[PDB]
Design a protein around this ligand. Sequence first.
Ligand SMILES: [Mg+2]
Ligand SMILES: [Mg+2]
Ligand SMILES: [Mg+2]
Ligand SMILES: [Mg+2]
Ligand SMILES: [Mg+2]
Ligand SMILES: [Mg+2]
Ligand SMILES: [Mg+2]
Ligand SMILES: [Mg+2]
Ligand SMILES: [Mg+2]
Ligand SMILES: [Mg+2]
Ligand SMILES: [Mg+2]
Ligand SMILES: [Mg+2]
Ligand SMILES: [Mg+2]
Ligand SMILES: [Mg+2]
Ligand SMILES: [Mg+2]
Ligand SMILES: [Mg+2]
Ligand SMILES: [Mg+2]
Ligand SMILES: [Mg+2]
Ligand SMILES: [Mg+2]
Ligand SMILES: [Mg+2]
Ligand SMILES: [Mg+2]
Ligand SMILES: [Mg+2]
Ligand SMILES: [Mg+2]
Ligand SMILES: [Mg+2]
Ligand SMILES: [Mg+2]
Ligand SMILES: [Mg+2]
Ligand SMILES: [Mg+2]
Ligand SMILES: [Zn+2]
Ligand SMILES: [Zn+2]
Lengths: 114, 69, 149, 120, 91
Amino acid sequence: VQRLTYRRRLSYNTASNKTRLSRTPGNRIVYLYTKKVGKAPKSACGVCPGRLRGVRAVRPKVLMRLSKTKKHVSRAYGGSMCAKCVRDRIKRAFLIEEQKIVVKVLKAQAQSQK
Amino acid sequence: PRKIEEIKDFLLTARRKDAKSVKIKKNKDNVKFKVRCSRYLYTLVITDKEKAEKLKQSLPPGLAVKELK
Amino acid sequence: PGRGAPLAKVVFRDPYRFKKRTELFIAAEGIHTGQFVYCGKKAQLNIGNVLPVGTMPEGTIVCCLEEKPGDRGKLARASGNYATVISHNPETKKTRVKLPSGSKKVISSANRAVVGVVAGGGRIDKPILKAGRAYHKYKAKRNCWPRVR
Amino acid sequence: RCRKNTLARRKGRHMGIGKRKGTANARMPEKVTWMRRMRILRRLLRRYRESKKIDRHMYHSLYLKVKGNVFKNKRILMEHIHKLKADKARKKLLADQAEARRSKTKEARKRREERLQAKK
Amino acid sequence: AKRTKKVGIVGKYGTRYGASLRKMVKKIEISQHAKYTCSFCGKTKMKRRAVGIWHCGSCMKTVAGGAWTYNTTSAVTVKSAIRRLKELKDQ
RNA sequence: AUAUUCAAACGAGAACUUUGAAGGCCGAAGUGGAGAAGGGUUCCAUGUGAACAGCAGUUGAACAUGGGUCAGUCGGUCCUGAGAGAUGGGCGAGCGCCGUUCCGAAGGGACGGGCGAUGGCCUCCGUUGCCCUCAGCCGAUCGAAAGGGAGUCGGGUUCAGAUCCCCGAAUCCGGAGUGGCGGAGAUGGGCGCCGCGAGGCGUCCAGUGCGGUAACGCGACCGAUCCCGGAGAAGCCGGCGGGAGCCCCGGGGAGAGUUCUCUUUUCUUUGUGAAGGGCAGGGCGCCCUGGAAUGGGUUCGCCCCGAGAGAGGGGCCCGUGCCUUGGAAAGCGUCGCGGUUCCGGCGGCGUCCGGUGAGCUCUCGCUGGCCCUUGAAAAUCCGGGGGAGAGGGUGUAAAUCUCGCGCCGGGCCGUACCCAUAUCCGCAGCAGGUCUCCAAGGUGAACAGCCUCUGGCAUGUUGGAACAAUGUAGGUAAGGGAAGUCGGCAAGCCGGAUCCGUAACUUCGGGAUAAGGAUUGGCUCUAAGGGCUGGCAGCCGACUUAGAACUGGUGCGGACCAGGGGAAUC
Ligand SMILES: [Mg+2]
Ligand SMILES: [Mg+2]
Ligand SMILES: [Mg+2]
Ligand SMILES: [Mg+2]
Ligand SMILES: [Mg+2]
Ligand SMILES: [Mg+2]
Ligand SMILES: [Mg+2]
Ligand SMILES: [Mg+2]
Ligand SMILES: [Mg+2]
Ligand SMILES: [Mg+2]
Ligand SMILES: [Mg+2]
Ligand SMILES: [Mg+2]
Ligand SMILES: [Mg+2]
Ligand SMILES: [Mg+2]
Ligand SMILES: [Mg+2]
Ligand SMILES: [Mg+2]
Ligand SMILES: [Mg+2]
Ligand SMILES: [Mg+2]
Ligand SMILES: [Mg+2]
Ligand SMILES: [Mg+2]
Ligand SMILES: [Mg+2]
Ligand SMILES: [Mg+2]
Ligand SMILES: [Mg+2]
Ligand SMILES: [Mg+2]
Ligand SMILES: [Mg+2]
Ligand SMILES: [Mg+2]
Ligand SMILES: [Mg+2]
Ligand SMILES: [Zn+2]
Ligand SMILES: [Zn+2]
């Protein structure tokens, strides 16, 4: 078989020295240096273990080239927090405000009674 | 490179100022018109020699055309 | 690494500017993520909260005690340890506490202290069975393990 | 030479007790054997379940039995399924005729009662 | 089939470290590798992450407990004492 | 550390140079192909044969002449790590030392407004000095050619250089008064009229984008100080699954080898890059309907479910696989012409169809286990919350745009070769030492040993003739079997796999391959173990196990690989 060599001055199997075999039009098997696999962003809620959806999974400096539409999703906190925690946050805010109103009115009624 | 699937848009690209040349590769079942622009190479592929010849006469006059084989 | 007791990452908001201040505490038993902890002079006495020893009733179990006011916690901060408030002296502003070694010490009542017992108790119960486990234990602390007589 | 010897080996020669150096598990692992058997049997069970030969309750029961290693082969499992279906069909037929008799006599007694009430 | 008579989880330790030591570590091993019930969701998915750190797989809620158990008798008696002292102070 | 032989050529001179033929070795954990540290011209051609290469040399890593290392996209350059180190400060007779945020007035920046000067058709903007206003750094600086770190691939080319030269396809970052152009913003509605109508005329009003219940999608789709978050950013081991490279199987071509006999035979070969577009194929702890015990689903194992399972219908991520632009023009294999030449010359023809596997290597993914072990930081980039502000009054639209195409630029240093039984260190061409990458066929459990293909070499600083003693390294010995010796030292016995069988003692885990037995070759069969298509029929298969007959001078783990055992004491 045709066993082959590196094409750079780095000879150690480190994280950056990662390759894959490819067949050229000249009918030869060479290495081709792959790029590191990217990761999708984590949700800012801090509880969900899954990665966000609708956002490309690329390396951090690749995101300069991409466009905002491919980088985020059309929603509040879009591309930064999962929809589950978004709706939970909305409901929490509304209910806390409602109970604050209830507490204020009950406190004022007690003060008026006393 | 890019693939152009229509005729009039390819013609507009041919009239583009940056178009440096066009090449016609006459292989079997296809005729490929390759327009060399500043950044991309645009190829329009058709499967009819009579479309090929009518397009060859309808090509821009000032464009440098060369047949290759 | 190197410390038996776990640590808690608690987020407060600055009362003087728009920010959020993150602090690292000694975790007391029973504290869970998402819990609310209250720090101050008039915070109610329940597990997790920190308040000065001069306000808690005697017999209270206390962890991460502060040896001098402002020191930000020095005493009873190893895994499973705690301290106990013994008696108060309303004049001279001093209180008596019992340290985990059994010594009784007098401190100023104006110093804060976490309520509860440090998490990770009974760590010494399990016997290290092998020099490998001992080696891994002291590798995360310092070069002192293979003691030669 | 290699191809001819391989053809002879495929026919079965040269593969006796004498020409063995590794253990039986080293030659053909038991984990792979069990894996293959479980895949085959579970596939058969799914095909029967979606072909509606067997119901989901019996499917779950004999799925747990397959995992518990009571069916050695596809054929053995298939004959067990046939015997179970036969016994179930007989019990179902007996139950149907019994309940038909019960319903018939119940409605006949109800008819007697209602015609008595109409007579009075 | 019952694979071993006396040794259980510490069967992995072979004929080493002494019978008394293996017996003593057996209970701690069982307690620290057992799965507990999440007092927040009720699912039995409370696992140990490190020493003194307990995590639930479904809630994603982490609780600071004991080294080899989810909770310690010292912790529970301190919690009871603290509750009673709070009730005494507020009368 | 197994090994040479025949003939020819040059040459004054050949055991050693070269060419051809033969016989061999390394045997893919190499005597192969490439790098790191280190060497520094040893690399390439010609010439010589004074000296050196422990014989010789027509040879050389020798000597003398001349040549050779080409980058925006390989790396340094940048960041910080363990750590080193100034200023302030302290100490010190003193050269100086401690110290790295500690006893410092440690910011020379800016959204924006005003003031005063200037150039450009002083329009509006830019360069500006001052005032008003806003503003934290963990401490200057150094620290990795294996860590972090956007961006180049295919073919050709020399004597010696190629991701560097040539040809062709790309790509990242930075710049832009008049924004170079297009597109987006964004061009609608109401009312009153003329006009058969279409449409047009004239007033008022809106216009910082749309679709999907939803996950989310569409080519953009304003916005500062400030705040939140993400990526960078991570352990080890086990199991399983997908995808590539290689190996294997059945054919079809082209060219070779054998053809005393046979072989539709044996061997070689049978391409498509990066970058875009679409689609298979994987994964989802994503969404909707709906509501489940006679519990169900499901993995090799697990595991999951009224905090919503099964059943349907959807969305997202990867996509290194296929097709397509690149692309057949090029590359390769064959047959044949031209240049006698000096040729990226010319020509035909082909570069095809399928199947498989607990196969080996790489990579992606799911999932588990172990820790009193929890398995980097920073530069850099990005999204979100907010609404300080800006833009036009209906038009020739404006502010603005992370959309498409276009224009310009990428400076400095390294780049040859060796990499090791001859370019490195050990005084040397020294059996020593020195960090890695790729890895074919058979046998076999196997990266074991043994033989072979691709590639490489000439037996390790000499040749010839004999075959004495004594040596060094191997063997074999009748009968006895440790009688030798301080002592079974040395050598020898056993050895793999399958089927039986297995004690004392014990911390119940072991002991244990205890000990002790039988079998194993070749050939011809039998049975069992599955997928696809429409309890049955057809079609595809791939390796194992068990049994039986026959047969050889009882021979069969036939080479290689390959446990002597037991009873006791310290
Ligand atoms: Mg390819
Ligand atoms: Mg999106
Ligand atoms: Mg030490
Ligand atoms: Mg050998
Ligand atoms: Mg080499
Ligand atoms: Mg080499
Ligand atoms: Mg040379
Ligand atoms: Mg000499
Ligand atoms: Mg270039
Ligand atoms: Mg630096
Ligand atoms: Mg110093
Ligand atoms: Mg570096
Ligand atoms: Mg690096
Ligand atoms: Mg479901
Ligand atoms: Mg061609
Ligand atoms: Mg915004
Ligand atoms: Mg080189
Ligand atoms: Mg030598
Ligand atoms: Mg020799
Ligand atoms: Mg010789
Ligand atoms: Mg003898
Ligand atoms: Mg004898
Ligand atoms: Mg004697
Ligand atoms: Mg003797
Ligand atoms: Mg011996
Ligand atoms: Mg024994
Ligand atoms: Mg004795
Ligand atoms: Zn969430
Ligand atoms: Zn829970």
